[PDB]
Design a protein around this ligand. Structure first.
Ligand SMILES: Oc1ccc(C(c2ccc(O)cc2)(C(F)(F)F)C(F)(F)F)cc1
Ligand SMILES: Oc1ccc(C(c2ccc(O)cc2)(C(F)(F)F)C(F)(F)F)cc1
Lengths: 9, 242, 230, 9
């Protein structure tokens, strides 16, 4: 899930 | 908490510092366009802005203090509002035109070129016109943008404890409110004028919420049409709504 | 335009005074029976709403066309905030009418409904914990009427909107709030209007989908108000 | 529109 991933960086 | 401790001026500095960059599009004015292609260009652009937005959110005081779960929710709820207010802000000094990118400045006549998009463009134009008549300031705009991120999803978050997640957010919002008053007092506004302008600014958020909801319905609809293809992150953000 | 020459006291009193009455429902549920009751009630509330509107200081100074526009844009928002207000002292419950007080489980009887119930209940709880006062409530309801459709047309409406703002702070100074509590409360109240707009947008889609499913026929008036949104 | 009528009493 892309957003989840970007928020974790 | 670092956020609940900043001064008005440090708050404004922090937000001004965290501003994402203005991106370019793949628009080629040598090429005439179609409704679908112009929608491809805008979709590609929004997808790239989104990535910048997510990393911008991390830099908004207080945001990082929340669970990944809460962060995800706020962005899912606020993303299109945030793209939109950013768009109207940079279009502010171009009456009758939307500045999607420095190399892409559209008027409504060309937005009519796509389906049901013209209603949204006109709303966006109206908002910019409103910003213009209020003479909105840069420090005010950054305050508003962070209010949207924090506020839009705060009522739709819930067993007992997460209740304290909501109270932290409300404290941060209160600080941003204090920040806006500070600014207005500085610009030499009477008390009555500060209150009135504060209300004027916040009421605009209602219209932005309205535009977002309309845009979301238009996006879901583009998808069902399989004409304009959507990016993966964005299909994902769209789905978090319907 | 008389609205501008009124004092805060007078404005508040005019607003409290224009308040519409609390109506009763026709005296468990299925989808058809539920939507039947609610749409019957909503139709009656609309008639009283239109009359309340004409009693909002400044509203009648607009051309008929502008009055229609404002009401067409704000009608569901105004129904919803009223609903939330009178449900305030019934935690967990939505007081549609004194004889029709529903909870969430009753919201699952209609497809797509429980999601909207939840948002409504959430708003009610927020108002409750803010200890929202009747005088504040009527100011908010009035702001929704003049604001929701204004940017989609003006100085007259913003003058009046400013007046209502002045009236809200006034009410707060009275209750004994400090300057800082005043501008913090003002903001808190106005930000909830954003959620109310969101609930309206979701509600309008839901309503449109139920018209499409032809679950119950809607009154001509309700259909007319719905249609103004597409 | 029915709204028009209602508004003009
Ligand atoms: O920075 C922005 C803001 C809005 C948009 C729009 C958009 C958003 C997503 C898309 O896939 C296409 C357009 C939206 F509908 F959201 F307003 C548009 F104005 F370009 F239409 C694109 C980029
Ligand atoms: O106080 C009311 C009465 C009816 C409603 C309606 C409604 C209630 C819940 C919804 O999810 C959608 C519409 C209903 F369909 F029930 F009549 C409507 F009038 F707005 F359509 C909302 C609020």
């Amino acid at each position: 899930k892309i957003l989840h991933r970007l928020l974790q960086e | 908490s670092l956020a609940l401790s900043l001064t008005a001026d440090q708050m404004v500095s922090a937000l001004l510092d965290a501003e994402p960059p203005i991106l370019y599009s793949e628009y080629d004015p040598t090429r005439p366009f179609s409704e679908a292609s112009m929608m491809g260009l805008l979709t590609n652009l929004a997808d790239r802005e989104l990535v910048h937005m997510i990393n911008w959110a991390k830099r908004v005081p207080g945001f990082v203090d929340l669970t990944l779960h809460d962060q995800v929710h706020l962005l899912e709820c606020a993303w299109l509002e945030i793209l939109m207010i950013g768009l109207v802000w940079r279009s502010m000094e171009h009456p009758g035109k939307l500045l999607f990118a420095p190399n892409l400045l559209l008027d409504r006549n060309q937005g009519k070129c796509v389906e049901g998009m013209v209603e949204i463009f006109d709303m966006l134009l109206a908002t910019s016109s409103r910003f213009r008549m209020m003479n909105l300031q840069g420090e005010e705009f950054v305050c508003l943008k962070s209010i949207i991120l924090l506020n839009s999803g705060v009522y739709t978050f819930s067993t007992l404890k997460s209740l304290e997640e909501k109270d932290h957010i409300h404290r941060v919002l209160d600080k941003i409110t204090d920040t806006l008053i500070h600014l207005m007092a500085k610009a030499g506004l009477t008390l009555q004028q500060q209150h009135q302008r504060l209300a004027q600014l916040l009421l605009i958020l209602s219209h932005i919420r309205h535009m977002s909801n309309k845009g979301m319905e238009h996006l879901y609809s583009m998808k069902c049409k399989n004409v304009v293809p959507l990016s993966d992150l964005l299909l994902e953000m769209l789905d978090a709504h319907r």
